[PDB]
Amino acid sequence: STLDGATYERVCSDTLDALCDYFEELTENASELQGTDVAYSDGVLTVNLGGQHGTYVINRQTPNKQIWLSSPTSGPKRYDFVGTVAAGRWIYKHSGQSLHELLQQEIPGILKSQSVDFLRLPYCS
């Protein structure tokens, strides 16, 4: 393939909607961590983890049929989808790790209060 426009929109929506839900799950449980907030609109997911840890941005970029990521520690990446509507993952041309594996690497050390597993979410097969 590539995912055509309609399929990309469905897969991207499912991927990002679930990530938003999970980041809300993690940050609403971490009640002791102040200055955190999750915002989500227009295909842009914002995870502000405070003044020390910075802000993640994960967003749909429709013209490119990609998901873009900016991490306060590892910087920017553009992800393409590989797979089908049934199962797939988001991959970046200069890393072996999927989007969700990157978050699994970087987030647990920040949210030490939580048991973190991004690999249970849709579209990281």
UniProtKB/Swiss-Prot annotation:
Catalytic activity: 4 Fe(2+) + O2 + 4 H(+) = 4 Fe(3+) + 2 H2O
Keywords attached to this entry: Heme biosynthesis, Ion transport, Iron, Iron storage, Iron transport, Lipid metabolism, Mitochondrion, Oxidoreductase, Steroid metabolism, Steroidogenesis, Transit peptide, Transport
Major location category of this protein: mitochondrion
Source domain of life: Eukaryota
EC number annotated for this UniProt entry: 1.16.3.1
Signal peptide: none
Cell compartments where the protein resides: Mitochondrion
Disruption of the gene: reported phenotype: RNAi-mediated knockdown results in nearly absent pupariation and reduced ecdysteroid peak level required to proceed to pupal stage. RNAi-mediated knockdown in the prothoracic gland results in delayed or absent pupariation.
UniProt GO molecular function: 2 iron, 2 sulfur cluster binding; enzyme activator activity; ferric iron binding; ferrous iron binding; ferroxidase activity; iron chaperone activity
GO biological process: [2Fe-2S] cluster assembly; adult locomotory behavior; axonal transport of mitochondrion; determination of adult lifespan; heme biosynthetic process; intracellular iron ion homeostasis; iron ion transport; iron-sulfur cluster assembly
Gene Ontology cellular component terms for the protein in this record: axon cytoplasm; mitochondrial [2Fe-2S] assembly complex; mitochondrial matrix; mitochondrion
Family: Belongs to the frataxin family.
Subunit structure: Monomer (probable predominant form). Oligomer. Interacts with IscU. Component of the mitochondrial core iron-sulfur cluster (ISC) assembly complex at least composed of the cysteine desulfurase Nfs1, the scaffold protein IscU, the accessory protein bcn92/Isd11/Lyrm4, and probably fh/frataxin.
General function of this protein: Promotes the biosynthesis of heme as well as the assembly and repair of iron-sulfur clusters by delivering Fe(2+) to proteins involved in these pathways. May play a role in the protection against iron-catalyzed oxidative stress through its ability to catalyze the oxidation of Fe(2+) to Fe(3+). May be able to store large amounts of the metal in the form of a ferrihydrite mineral by oligomerization. Required for ecdysteroidogenesis in the prothoracic gland which is necessary for larval to pupal transition.
Name of this protein: Frataxin homolog, mitochondrial
Species this chain originates from: Drosophila melanogaster
From-to range in the entire protein, with total length: 66 to 190 of 190
